[PDB]
Design a protein around this ligand. Sequence first.
Ligand SMILES: CCCCCCCCCCCCCCCC(=O)O
Ligand SMILES: CCCCCCCCCCCCCCCC(=O)O
Lengths: 128, 119
Amino acid sequence: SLKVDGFTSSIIFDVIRDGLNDPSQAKQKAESIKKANAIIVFNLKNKAGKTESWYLDLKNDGDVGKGNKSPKGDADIQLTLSDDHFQQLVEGKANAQRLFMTGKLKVKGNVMKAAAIEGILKNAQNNL
Amino acid sequence: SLKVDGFTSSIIFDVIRDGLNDPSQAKQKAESIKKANAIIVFNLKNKAGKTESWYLDLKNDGDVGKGNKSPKGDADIQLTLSDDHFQQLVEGKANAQRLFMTGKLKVKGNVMKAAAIEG
Ligand SMILES: CCCCCCCCCCCCCCCC(=O)O
Ligand SMILES: CCCCCCCCCCCCCCCC(=O)O
């Protein structure tokens, strides 16, 4: 339901939302917001030339939703890459730093904080 | 055998074990472990209200067994579904993303591993 047709990686946002919002993740969620203190927007591009965005609010209460903007504020970080590369990145087939360095991943806002997000997200979302 | 009475789909665990362990599939088994690097637990539910779990260890040696934990470590990802839908899924009669969108399939654990295993 955060999934959008024509973006095959987007199903991942539902899985991330369920993991992060799981009330058993309350502590992890709070620690992640403390660490990240950031609203991160993902702008995905597909081959048909479409753009779709999702937000990850690790700054206020912890939320994942559809849109290029949290309802509780503007993005601190914007990450722009293709559907394909986002898939690869979530799988671990591509490294975010290599994608950045080869022009596949564009970042607006702090690149150091951007790098840290991967590990901070991993911890908050992982509800097993 | 890994299958359990009242779980019609559970024969797939015996099937997966034999197919994975077939000496002819040594290269494939190795690649799957290399690629997945994950312990997957299946929690199945039936119409009688019962729950049974199996694990598929694609991180260590490639074992399939009964229970909600591998002996050689904790689960990275957990899939919960009904006996009925799991059978459909295994027989290529239902799609995993569709089951997940309609709430028939519940996923817990590492999003990276979840992504990696689906393929
Ligand atoms: C390798 C598996 C990753 C699983 C976690 C999914 C979250 C993906 C978001 C990654 C954010 C990192 C962006 C790095 C930006 C940079 O420093 O170039
Ligand atoms: C016929 C092969 C099936 C036997 C092996 C069982 C594995 C089937 C389950 C597929 C994994 C589903 C992961 C999708 C979760 C998601 O990211 O939405």
